Design a protein around this ligand. Structure first.
Ligand SMILES: CN(C)CCCN1c2ccccc2CCc2ccc(Cl)cc21
Ligand code: NA
Ligand code: NA
Length: 504
């Protein structure tokens, strides 16, 4: 089996995964909408009671199975719980990231496209007035995505977008085909620094942004000024518990699969705690000092509310480009911004797509090459649904993430800590650890953590399930029909896996 070459490269791959566009975009938005500085209170809390424990747990389940030559949750869940239902419940941890990758790699391509489009100077140039600057970059984005001009639920992306996508894929395979050490880790050693460099440089430039409407200081102020009145709202406490899940990226089986390339007795307690610290430092410091300040700097603090309600997506592909088109030589900032996001995704997309490669390697005994190419073929195929069918993207994200984090996460907990046994698990977590997990985390892992996930499951099931189930168009069934067909397919490979093992 393959293994990590360096302790650093491990943390950098892990942090490479965890570090998102979400750090630079989703995280700052969630803050401003839910108390600003006050959002840190429920955020830090859920970071200790939920994010930190589960992190160790996925890491633990990973190494526990990874020693036994099994990186995927179909196998691992069978080892923690030797049941027929455990393999099935484990299929999700192979189904969840595959579905997400069916659109993430595509979204990742946009950045590369936009980066190229911004580098060569092929960008809209306005014209004064806010809508008279945003609309050119609002339409620029729609041409790339291929947003429908008719009632039809049919996207028609530009030929260039498609080409960049293939290129983007080709980039992913290029790193993936070189294994864990000479590929992901080797790249994580290059990407993570390159990422930090761009972040700071942007942050610096952003702080030097002065417009008639305001300054960057006004953005940091608005963002970090704590409105505690919103902490009374349960919705803030929920949006917090989820945001951490999203930022750390738990409940996708990726941490598990990654931690399955960790040797049997190498530390996972501190290693994970470090990668987790890197991601969150990146969010609050870097990410929360580029977008929101630059937005507030240009559109005043008056629109700082309206900007936040405009969704993170707009801020990154419409608002921030349109802002850069006005600054001194900002066509290069556009290139720097997008290329920053490109890597942020590229360090993650290679990570998530490894879970499938590992499955074919471990269970179906495929070479790394074949496991890589076939996985690329599956993701490339599915992506056409997201590329061409409208709102297919959102449907995939809704199910794979919305459910996949809340359901599979609480599944990882009960299987490893309640079924496999708390004590046997607690030792499996602390084992090899340079430091030891505090004794109090035993109660958090066993009672407090699943208490939160449980409350989270209930609130989610009431609010989000009746919405997508009726009010939506009929083409959502096509997306549903497809993603269901994937789970049924992975059920068949899991079946083929166990039938190949009884023979030998
Ligand atoms: C930067 N990260 C948060 C790591 C996850 C990125 N990501 C993702 C992003 C948004 C929502 C769900 C998921 C699911 C995990 C997963 C799995 C494979 C890939 Cl190719 C990306 C991917
Ligand atoms: Na993150
Ligand atoms: Na990343």
């Amino acid at each position: 089996r393959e293994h990590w070459a360096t302790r650093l490269g491990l943390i950098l791959a892990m942090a490479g995964y965890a570090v998102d566009l979400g750090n630079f975009l989703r995280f700052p938005v969630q803050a401003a909408e839910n108390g600003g500085g006050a959002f840190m209170i429920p955020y830090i809390i859920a970071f200790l009671l939920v994010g930190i424990p589960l992190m160790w747990i996925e890491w633990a389940m990973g190494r526990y199975g990874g020693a036994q030559g099994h990186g995927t949750t179909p196998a691992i869940f069978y080892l923690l719980w030797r049941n027929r239902f455990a393999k099935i419940l484990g299929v999700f941890g192979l189904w969840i990231p595959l579905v997400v990758a069916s659109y993430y790699v595509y979204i990742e391509s946009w950045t590369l496209g936009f980066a190229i489009k911004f580098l060569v100077g092929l960008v809209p140039e306005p014209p004064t007035d806010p809508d008279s600057i945003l609309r050119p970059f609002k339409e620029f984005l729609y041409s790339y995505i291929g947003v429908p001009k008719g009632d039809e639920p049919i996207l028609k992306p530009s030929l260039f977008a498609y080409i960049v996508f293939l290129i983007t894929m080709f980039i992913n395979v290029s790193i993936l085909i070189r294994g864990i050490s000479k590929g992901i880790e080797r790249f994580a050693k290059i990407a993570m620094p390159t990422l930090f460099i761009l972040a700071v440089f942007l942050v610096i430039r952003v702080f030097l942004l002065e417009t008639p409407n305001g300054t960057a200081a006004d953005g940091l102020n608005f963002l970090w000024t704590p409105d505690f009145e919103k902490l009374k709202d349960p919705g803030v406490w929920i949006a917090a518990v989820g945001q951490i899940f999203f930022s750390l990226g738990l409940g996708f089986g990726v941490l598990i699969t990654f931690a399955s390339y960790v040797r049997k007795d190498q530390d996972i307690v501190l290693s994970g705690l470090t990668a987790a610290t890197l991601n969150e430092k990146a969010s609050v410091i870097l990410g929360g000092s580029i977008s929101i300040p630059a937005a507030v700097a240009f559109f005043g603090v008056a629109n700082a509310v309206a900007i936040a309600k405009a969704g993170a997506f707009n801020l990154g592909f419409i608002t921030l480009p349109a802002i850069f088109s006005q600054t001194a030589g900002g066509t290069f900032l556009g290139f720097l911004w997008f290329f920053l996001l490109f890597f942020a995704g590229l360090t993650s997309s290679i990570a998530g797509m490894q879970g499938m490669i590992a499955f074919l390697e471990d269970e179906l005994k495929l070479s790394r090459k074949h496991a890589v190419l076939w996985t690329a073929a599956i993701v490339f195929f599915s992506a056409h649904l997201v590329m061409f069918l409208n709102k297919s993207l959102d449907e995939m994200d809704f199910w794979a993430t919305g459910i996949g984090v809340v359901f599979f996460g609480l599944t990882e907990l009960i299987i490893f800590f309640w079924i496999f046994g708390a004590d046997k698990a607690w030792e499996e977590i602390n084992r090899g650890g340079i430091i030891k997990v505090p004794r109090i985390y035993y109660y958090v892992m066993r009672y407090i953590t699943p208490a939160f996930l449980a409350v989270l499951l209930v609130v989610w099931a009431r609010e989000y399930i009746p919405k997508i189930m009726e009010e939506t168009h009929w083409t959502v069934w096509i997306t549903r029909f497809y993603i269901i067909g994937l789970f049924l397919f992975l059920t068949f490979l899991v079946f083929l896996a166990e039938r190949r093992r009884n023979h030998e």
